[PDB]
Amino acid sequence: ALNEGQIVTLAVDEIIETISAITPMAQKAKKYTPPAASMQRSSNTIWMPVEQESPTQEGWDLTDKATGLLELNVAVNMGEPDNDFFQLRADDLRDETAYRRRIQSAARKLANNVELKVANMAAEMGSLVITSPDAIGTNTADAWNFVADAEEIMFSRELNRDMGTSYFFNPQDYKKAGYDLTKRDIFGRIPEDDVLRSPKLPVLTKSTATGITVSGAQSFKPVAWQLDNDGNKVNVDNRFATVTLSATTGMKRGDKISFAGVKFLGQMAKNVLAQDATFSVVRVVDGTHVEITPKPVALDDVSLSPEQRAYANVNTSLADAMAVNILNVKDARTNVFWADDAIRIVSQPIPANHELFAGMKTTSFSIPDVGLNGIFATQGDISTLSGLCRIALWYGVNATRPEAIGVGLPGQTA
């Protein structure tokens, strides 16, 4: 008993409000709108610049010193839209409340997909790994202060533009951390330190690799561009570095690794930190090759030009036979934290031709709080004697600066 316009308005309003309500993580990720918004279905590889770091320029005369600086880009592939294709039945459309219930159920699945993607990307791409044999709690003597350690490691490392980080707990560790939650939203947002809890934080399975050592002396340098097969210049994603190892058995995407001698550096000040350099493998290429999500650029590397050395983030390079420590020795449900632009959500409006083809009524909407662009379409089918309804969300989550994304792993007793 709902007319067409009423169907469209109620559905779009329900989708927008419920997705903006039940997406805590996706609202903490920076919203990126591609500069080139065109009506094309092919997914372009958007190259967003990362912050430029330059060597210290001192003195009155600076001749030919602006030139030669490196500008590096990171790539995001939006891919294909996330759809929820279902049928609208008579009981759904009998009144406004039932229709809102059905549309809420659909948009709840879409918000599931967005949050699951963000949480999994943060857990499997986060490299600022902090572990402790103890469990998270308020007991100073025997428990682990995840928030304090995360803040300390982000401050020491200087990867936070001084706007604060975002800490996400899983409900078990949020309960153990003694957060009152009575004066807080369901997620802990203080409705009208920003510590929140999410139920979609994955459990990071243990890694069984034991005897892993670096295969040979390997040094990585930030490369601005490379020639593709056509001969044109294409930027190089300077996040991931391929490391040759003795063996990669028992290594999977998301495993957090560290190297024996390699240490963090203060990102801006280039001073050696106490904490060992922690990396996350994003892909296992071969039996002897892995791909770690922050690229280890060594200060002591003499082959680096000063412009390249301005991006150094580790104490030393990888030696001939260097032990590869495994941080996720035990199964633990992840707690993640990231700073500023560590995760970006890239989305542009879905190309559509409204009111052009009779039978299909497509309405294009946008969720401003989350930064997702979508389309809502209905059509009638006689193979089901019901109105097909489709909700699409076209977005791409990118983990820009994986060095700024952290994973907290409690109870790594080993």
Binding site: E4, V8, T9, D13, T363, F365
Partner: peptide
């Protein structure tokens, strides 16, 4: 009071098919 009149305006906007006006009026109602 005026809540019942803005509810009628919301219903008219919804029947017309304007999502933006419906959402603005819903925010006004709350």
């Amino acid at each position: 009071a005026n809540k019942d009149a803005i509810r009628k305006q919301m219903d008219a906007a919804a029947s017309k098919g304007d999502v933006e006006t419906y959402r603005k009026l819903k925010a006004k109602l709350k």
